[PDB]
Amino acid sequence: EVEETLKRLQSQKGVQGIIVVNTEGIPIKSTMDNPTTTQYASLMHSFILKARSTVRDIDPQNDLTFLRIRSKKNEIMVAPDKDYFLIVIQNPT
Amino acid sequence: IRWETKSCQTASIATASASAQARNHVDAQVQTEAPVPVSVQPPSQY
């Protein structure tokens, strides 16, 4: 079921890859090449920790809901969860 | 009328050299290791 929905997302014209980060920055599923698989998973793990702390710091009664990062090259979206988040990368062009 | 001549002598002494020194230092060197025993994507089945 979820395998089909992930493929469905991957088929979207914007999406350039999906990484399922599970073990604290170490993913278990990917539709991307190995260097990118680890690159995005690791970097975004560090970032989301900062983003979630940022929310707790700006207000001590709230957690993260979502983050978006945009760049000239590509755009990356992540959502927080109880155990682990998911990374999706799109080509804005 | 009786003047007696006498000679007196005191004992000698003995000294010894010695030294003092505060606590000593010594160098040290460390290099932090950067091990990364991390695979790319282990397909877990937890």
From Swiss-Prot, chain A:
Q: What does this protein do?
A: Acts as one of several non-catalytic accessory components of the cytoplasmic dynein 1 complex that are thought to be involved in linking dynein to cargos and to adapter proteins that regulate dynein function. Cytoplasmic dynein 1 acts as a motor for the intracellular retrograde motility of vesicles and organelles along microtubules.
Q: Does the keyword Nuclease apply?
A: no
Under the subunit heading, UniProt states:
Homodimer. The cytoplasmic dynein 1 complex consists of two catalytic heavy chains (HCs) and a number of non-catalytic subunits presented by intermediate chains (ICs), light intermediate chains (LICs) and light chains (LCs); the composition seems to vary in respect to the IC, LIC and LC composition. The heavy chain homodimer serves as a scaffold for the probable homodimeric assembly of the respective non-catalytic subunits. The ICs and LICs bind directly to the HC dimer and the LCs assemble on the IC dimer. Interacts with DYNLRB2. Interacts with DYNC1I1 and DYNC1I2.
Q: Which family does it belong to?
A: Belongs to the GAMAD family.
Which InterPro entries does UniProt cross-reference here? Answer: DYNLRB1/2 (IPR016561), Roadblock/LAMTOR2_dom (IPR004942)
Q: Which UniProt keywords are listed?
A: Acetylation, Cytoplasm, Cytoskeleton, Dynein, Microtubule, Motor protein, Transport
Q: Where does it reside?
A: Cytoplasm, Cytoskeleton
* Tissue expression notes: High expression in heart, liver, brain and pancreas; moderate in placenta, skeletal muscle and kidney; low in lung, prostate, testis, small intestine and colon. Isoform 1 expression is up-regulated in 64% hepatocellular carcinoma (HCC) patients.
Write out the GO cellular component annotations: centrosome; ciliary tip; cilium; cytoplasm; cytoplasmic dynein complex; dynein complex; membrane; microtubule
> This chain belongs to which protein, by name?
Dynein light chain roadblock-type 1
Which SUPFAM superfamilies does the entry mention? Roadblock/LC7 domain (SSF103196)
Q: Which organism is it from?
A: Homo sapiens
Extract the GO molecular function terms from the UniProt entry.
dynein intermediate chain binding; identical protein binding; microtubule motor activity
Question: Record keywords: Chaperone included?
Answer: no
GO biological process annotations for this chain's record? Answer: microtubule-based movement; visual behavior
Query: Main site of residence?
Result: cytoplasm
Swiss-Prot record, chain B:
The entry's note on the tissues where this protein occurs is:
Expressed in several cell lines (at protein level).
Which stretches of sequence are listed as region DYNLL2 binding?
A: 23-36
Q: Where in the cell is it found?
A: Cytoplasm; Cytoplasm, Cytoskeleton, Cilium basal body; Cytoplasm, Cytoskeleton, Cilium axoneme; Cytoplasm, Cytoskeleton, Microtubule organizing center, Centrosome
Provide the disulphide bond pattern. none
Q: Subunit structure of this entry?
A: The cytoplasmic dynein 2 complex consists of two catalytic heavy chains (HCs) and a number of non-catalytic subunits presented by intermediate chains (ICs), light intermediate chains (LICs) and light chains (LCs). Among them, a heavy chain (DYNC2H1), two intermediate chains (DYNC2I2 and DYNC2I1), a light intermediate chain (DYNC2LI1), and a light chain (DYNLT2B) are unique to the cytoplasmic dynein complex 2, but a subset of the light chains are also shared by dynein-1 and dynein-2 complexes.
Task: Name the protein family.
Answer: Belongs to the dynein light intermediate chain family.
Q: What does this protein do?
A: Acts as one of several non-catalytic accessory components of the cytoplasmic dynein 2 complex (dynein-2 complex), a motor protein complex that drives the movement of cargos along microtubules within cilia and flagella in concert with the intraflagellar transport (IFT) system. DYNC2I2 plays a major role in retrograde ciliary protein trafficking and in ciliogenesis. Required also to maintain a functional transition zone.
Q: Which illness does the annotation name?
A: Short-rib thoracic dysplasia 11 with or without polydactyly: A form of short-rib thoracic dysplasia, a group of autosomal recessive ciliopathies that are characterized by a constricted thoracic cage, short ribs, shortened tubular bones, and a 'trident' appearance of the acetabular roof. Polydactyly is variably present. Non-skeletal involvement can include cleft lip/palate as well as anomalies of major organs such as the brain, eye, heart, kidneys, liver, pancreas, intestines, and genitalia.
This protein is called Cytoplasmic dynein 2 intermediate chain 2
Native organism is: Homo sapiens (Human)
State the gene name recorded for this protein: DYNC2I2
What portion of the full-length protein is represented by this chain?
58 to 103 of 536
